[PDB]
Amino acid sequence: AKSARASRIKENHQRFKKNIAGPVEAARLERLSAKLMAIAQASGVKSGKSIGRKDSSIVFPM
Amino acid sequence: MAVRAQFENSNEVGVFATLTNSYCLVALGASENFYSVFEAELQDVIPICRTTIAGTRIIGRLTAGNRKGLLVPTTTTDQELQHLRNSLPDDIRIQRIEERLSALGNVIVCNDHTALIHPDLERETEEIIADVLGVEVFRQTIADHVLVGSYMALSNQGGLVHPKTSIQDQDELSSLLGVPLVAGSVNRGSNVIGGGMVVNDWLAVTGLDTTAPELSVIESVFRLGEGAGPGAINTSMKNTIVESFY
Amino acid sequence: TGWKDIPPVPTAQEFIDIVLSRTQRRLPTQIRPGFKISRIRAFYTRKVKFTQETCSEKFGAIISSFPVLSDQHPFHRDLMNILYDADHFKVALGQISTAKNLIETISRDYVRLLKYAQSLYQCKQLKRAALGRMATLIKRLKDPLIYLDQVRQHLARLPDINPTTRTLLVAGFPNVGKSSFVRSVTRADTPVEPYAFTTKSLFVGHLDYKYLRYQVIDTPGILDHPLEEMNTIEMQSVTALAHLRAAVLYFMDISEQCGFSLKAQINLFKSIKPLFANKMVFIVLNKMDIKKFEELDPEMQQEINDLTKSGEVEILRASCATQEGVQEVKNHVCERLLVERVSQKLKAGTHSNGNIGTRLQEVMARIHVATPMDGTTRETFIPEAVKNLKKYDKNDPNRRVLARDIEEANGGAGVFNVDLRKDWILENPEWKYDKIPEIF
Amino acid sequence: KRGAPGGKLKMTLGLPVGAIMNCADNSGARNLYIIAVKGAGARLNRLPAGGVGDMVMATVKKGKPELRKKVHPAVIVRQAKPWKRFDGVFLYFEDNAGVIVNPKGEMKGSAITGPVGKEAAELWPRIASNAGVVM
Amino acid sequence: VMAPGVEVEISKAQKDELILSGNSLEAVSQSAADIQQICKVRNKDIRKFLDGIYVSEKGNIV
Amino acid sequence: MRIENCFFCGRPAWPSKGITFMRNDGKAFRFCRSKCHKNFKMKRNPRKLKWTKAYRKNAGKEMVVDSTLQFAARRNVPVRYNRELWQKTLKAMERISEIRARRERVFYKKRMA
Amino acid sequence: GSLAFLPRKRAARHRGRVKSFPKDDPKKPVHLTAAMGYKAGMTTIVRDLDRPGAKAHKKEVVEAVTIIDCPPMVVVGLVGYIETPRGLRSLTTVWAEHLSDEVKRRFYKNWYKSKKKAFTKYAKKYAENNGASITRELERIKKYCTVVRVLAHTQIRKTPLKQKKAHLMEIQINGGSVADKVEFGRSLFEKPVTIDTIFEKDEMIDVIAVTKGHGFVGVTARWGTKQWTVARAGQMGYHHRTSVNHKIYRIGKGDDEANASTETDLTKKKITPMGGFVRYGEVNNDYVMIKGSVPGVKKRIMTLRKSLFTHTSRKALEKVELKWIDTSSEFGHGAFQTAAEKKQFMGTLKKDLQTS
RNA sequence: GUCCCUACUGAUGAACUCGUCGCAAUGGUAAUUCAGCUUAGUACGAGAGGAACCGCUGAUUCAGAUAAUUGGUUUUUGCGGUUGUCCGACCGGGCAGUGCCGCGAAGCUACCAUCUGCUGGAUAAUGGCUGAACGCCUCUAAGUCAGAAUCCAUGCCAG
RNA sequence: CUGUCCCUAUCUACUAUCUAGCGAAACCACAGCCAAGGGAACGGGCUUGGCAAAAUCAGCGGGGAAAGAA
RNA sequence: GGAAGUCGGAAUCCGCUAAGGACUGUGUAACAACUCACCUGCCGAAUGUACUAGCCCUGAAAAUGGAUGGCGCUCAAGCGU
């Protein structure tokens, strides 16, 4: 019998994933993301916009 | 019209089918090829119900009925019975019976005027069959085989009985019933006519292995295919049958 | 049923390569000189044996797969005898058998010598000798292997002709219309070309008449020659003409189209009538569309009538181009076969003692119809939609959608979801598709 | 063609190899001796077993001399070892019984004494035809 | 799926035939070979089953 | 799906709960648990064992004649689906349940007067 | 036995780690990957199957499901990761206001004697206008990170166990740009996330847990017997496992008061069995009822995550039509769904008469 | 007729302030086979017979889990019956190294019970494209396409 | 029915983790991680590679035992 | 039976010549047709047959993972002087 790692089996799996499971999970994720977004929305140095320095080795100690 | 089909790959159509002159019952499984052939041969003339009895696909061998009623065993569940009622019109009365012999399609044969049952049923079952089907019910054996529902087919135009019945036995059933009766085989020599055929007054469905001579026998016996089909053809044009089934 | 199940017969080189590869690869091939002498002996003895059983299995398969000419129906027996030179066939099989015996003897002798061997070199030489002696034997059996391969292919391609079945055997002279009639009557592909010996073998097709299955056998074509001096292909037809209970259809052409005189056809018939000893004999005159029967000299008309006034040989007329009477010839000849066969069956069943046979009782039981003594009929209610209904045809454009086409369009076989509530007849049709309360 | 039923669900196997079983049809045999089963997966040291609706290859111990000459295929119709049907209902029969069947799937007898297992009735159409009680 | 830059036409010049035109010879020929290889028969008789999609003519557009 | 009643004791035999036995006579014995199964296999009498509805109704510990008790029955001639019928059936179920409970209280008090 | 699960060492951590999140591509919408829960037990269901091709089609089949109590999960942190030649590296983390006593208990070991001084200076780092520092950390995540995760902890306070220590984990955000997911996490700080917002019904998921321990077990039960490939005696059980492909059949809201009700049995009842879940208690919160068995002991922490790959079976696309939910007592051979049913069945008793 | 060291399997561990949350070098690695429905009594075939890809569903072996249910186990010595003997009798109990018998929850188990077991690239045999050697030709020399349960990884286990 | 096998029952005998206290003997050149090579079917120390992290507990099914040759 | 060079047996000649075999293969039931040998036109300058001598591949291999000493080495860190 064809193994689970066969090239043909992988091709058929790819078509099934692209044609049916793809759209189904897309709509499912759309609904879940909508719900989660709904419940979630339910000077540079002194402002933080300019990212600065906070607070074994790679080079040889000179 | 006599046609040839198989359920999935099985030629025993009587196991999975049940025809009366007012409804058809078809087993549920996989594809709708069986449903398609049955509806093509019964094009909405009578209702057809895709059903299950006892969670099983042998509805033909588990059920029996006529144009005036339908009969199911006690193992039938209420959802299935509700399905049957909503699928069939009010002009057919459906009853479930608490009988020990649950193989109703194997123990009860029925035409829309008479009936013939296994000699080992109950009295209460006898009167309730006689009431629900509204037919005269008798107690006989065929070919010394107790399963008349399995080893014989019947209609209001004819009857096919076990190929190995004696002449006087055939005459006795003819006198009892009143319908012209001929003994013949189905599905290439099979003895289970009840399981290999399902026959209504205007339609027959046999298995695909049913040979042409025995299909001609079937048509001539039950006046199918309009034409003539008297059974007088069986008597007169006998060369075909004597050659084929010798 | 057939002879297509003959396994391929190798050539000598292929057989040698197969047997030696097999004993090389399926069996260990690594021994060392420092091992026990008993182990060395066992190793080489096992090698020689395994080779012997491989050869014996192959040769036995060859000998037992091919049919034995003794137990066939003499139709098939004579057909094989004329088509394969049964003498050469049997001597080839005998050479295979004696080679099998020689190989098994060589194996036994060399196993004994190996038993009494005393060194690894001796064992190796004894193995080499045994396996090479068996090879020389095969190289001797080069040619019979080729002959057996050829006959195997020809038998695998031979048609299935049932000796005892209701048969229409069409014979006659080259270019009378046998192949044309065969293609016009059945669906077997028999070549039709205007040259002499187009059909050079036996062809078979099948027919349906009164729900019985009939055989039809097209023969090559016989030529005015005393049987002893005929060709092989010609004898293929004569064996068919001889060992088949059938209706012989001898084709004569009223017109001189074929190339042989009407006197020549009349001659051949009178010559092979002993072949048509008791088979049902029908002469059919074809090519009426070019020369009708009435357009002849009354002298030949009267010779034909004199042939008619003899036995139960029957003259029919047909035309394998306009198909004017092919169906009529079919009907008449097949009906006569059917009635003759049922008659002989009834006679065979009717014993002298007067006791009806069991099979005859059974067929009478299957023929008898049982009817009520009173003779009263029973009323049935056929709905008028049945009589005013239109038959289903799968090629019609405006058919009805139908459940199988519905599932095919809306999915596949294990995909479509069947809606079981669509046929529910309720009071309010909106109440459909409702979860029915069940427990409380 | 091996008489292995198709689509059969997983069920508890209760009739092993080397089993004594009753005969449920009018074929004239009384008991059968299961010596092999069909469609089994050969694993080391396990004695194969079959449930109702499974073809086994068995020899008749006592019965009709004509039947007591050959080894015969047979499908078992009743199983005393409990098993569960997909409707969740666990169940078992009073004994262990089967019917002699030809390799094609046609029974030699004409009537089956006692009830018939639902799985066997589903799998073999002939048993559903010659069955008296189906549970 | 074809190599970039090849045009495919079902012409109404002959029945049941196809044209694969292009500018790169390697791409054109490799695409033709790919279609020929994908439509190939399995476990049948070559001498008996003659069906397929096969290259017929090779040349230049102008 | 149906709420079966145990053959031996009479408690509700829910699906996936228990074992059923098939006698050769052709009718099925459904038991709700291993207690009932083992008791029947030992062939004890449910009519005699005092933890069974059979014993309760034979010794007169539970009412056996009441219109509330004739409303309940297995139905052998099926009916067509009818939404208002089913809803009114639900409401009737509630009413009959409370009436049964209250009459059962009265029966118990009249017995243990 | 198996040469894959061969270091038969006990799991180093009782919680279990995801070890693989589904591959991220910005095209999908922004969402969280995993969640936690606590195992309660199993119950029995019957399902009107709709599976074309199976003999159980259009029939009722008895099926085994497991209950996982999942109270709302509080989001308290956001971790930003960078991609390096040595792998993924935690660039930096940002916590939130007012971490709860349960997550602080997770941080501490001897919580009773300790001075509960966790994240005090971090609360000051917010409240003292170092929002500049917190924003610079957020922009560092936006500008330098490629994988963003959310620190989330459960509510043992709602879960009915003697424990009081929460369970933190990092749940990866998928489907969007780094800026979008950072904004999502920052907006999600200090708000519980619900299991019906993380998963939904009929979604085949993956469960990660620690399978029950059995201690020192001989080869007969360790390997199923009659070099490192030879069966040896040692620790069997307490093993980290990730079991795949388990269809979530129902998400119960907990507050519906009819969690165990289906459309066919109009019985107002909850999932909690009559007498409570054995050795666990009552499921009074949102619950996930999942097909089949699940690794782990009752009341054990669970990790529920999405499948790493798109599904290849009709089993995942299937809709589930429940018929009834088992509520009978797991403490023995029960037969009554509700106390009202038991009272109506058995009538009144001596204690009832003496009390009334 | 001459209880110890080491390997393997697991379990602890000081030093780095304790703790939490992670990364992944390296090491192991896993799935296997059969059957049924549709294709289809179609292709093909004189006839008898009679496939395959796509789609669907199960089963065997192996592996990892699990206690809804079912079966087994009983020191729950939980409840009841009963033998000998004893505490004057009843009640309630003791002894017979768990007296024996029935049921027996919890727990543990059982393909005797149930659940799950996944996707990319590169290759061999081979089939090719373009094109020299060699003014024909050529799958090969330069370049290059596809292709086995093969190789290497992800998924998985250890860290 | 058995000059056959297995399981259940009984009896006989040997079968036992940690703490307190008491407390041997066998045996012991020194040791003890592997693979290839080390002509004398010889390796445990040598060559050159794999490598290689303190201190311990438990299990144990492997090695630390064998010829002498007509 | 059919066999026209090509299912078979034997010889294999002459003319025309530039050259063409009572024919090297494909093909037909036979033909027909194609093709080879050979010949002419175009092109234009070196070819092609057999051996010999270096180097390289194969010229036979089992079974714990390992060995030009190891790394590694390709107009060498290989080979000859």
Ligand SMILES: Nc1nc2c(ncn2[C@@H]2O[C@H](COP(=O)(O)OP(=O)(O)OP(=O)(O)O)[C@@H](O)[C@H]2O)c(=O)[nH]1
């Ligand atoms: N005009 C006419 N010609 C016919 C008729 N039947 C056969 N032929 C001729 O027969 C020729 C072919 O020969 P076949 O029909 O095959 O005759 P055959 O007996 O099979 O012998 P073969 O020719 O060797 O096969 C055709 O070309 C037709 O012209 C007929 O009925 N009418």
Ligand SMILES: [Zn+2]
């Ligand atoms: Zn009960």
